[PDB]
């Protein structure tokens, strides 16, 4: 569209040349009764009514 | 345990023997409580049931293990008094004195069965 030599144009890149190593954990949350998973689970109840 | 087994009816005949013993001393101490029923435990029948659970399952080492937490029968009265004490002295203090006899024969007993198991493996 411009035509050839009626354009110029020149670049500057700022790189990365740092090793870098990561390691990521998630823990998905299970305070709500309805997705929390369960494997063992103990309920003593007691009423003594006077 | 197999060792259990073997010591499992004397611990048990033990431990009912200090129950009705702490028992027999409750109805001594509430002897002058107006209103108040002379209670106690069927010693055979109870030891037949204690005689006769579930550790919840531990996945990793924070997961928290299970945590742990007998029926009582009136007296017959004899005489009746008007403050409605059924507590009867001498009914009680002879069940209180067999029962301290038996606990010491329980105990012996018990000692006996230790002491042969030991001299078993001693060498």
Redesign the interface.
């Known amino acids: 569209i411009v035509g050839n030599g009626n354009v110029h144009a020149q670049v500057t890149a700022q790189l990365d040349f740092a090793n870098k190593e990561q390691t990521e954990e998630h823990y998905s949350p299970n305070g709500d009764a309805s997705k929390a998973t369960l494997?063992?689970?103990?309920l003593?109840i007691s009423e003594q009514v006077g | 345990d197999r060792l259990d087994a073997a010591l499992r009816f004397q611990q048990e005949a033990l431990n009912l023997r200090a129950q009705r013993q702490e028992i027999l001393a409750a109805n001594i101490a509430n002897a002058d409580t107006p209103g108040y029923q002379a209670r106690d435990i069927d010693f055979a029948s109870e030891l037949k049931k204690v005689m006769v659970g579930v550790a919840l399952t531990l996945t990793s080492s924070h997961h928290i293990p299970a945590q742990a937490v007998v029926d009582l029968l009136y007296r017959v009265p004899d005489q009746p008094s008007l403050d409605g004490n059924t507590v009867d002295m001498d009914r009680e203090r002879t069940q209180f004195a067999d029962n301290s006899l038996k606990y010491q024969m329980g105990l012996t007993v018990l000692g006996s069965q230790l002491k042969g198991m030991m001299n078993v493996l001693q060498g």
């Open positions: 494997r063992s689970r103990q003593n």
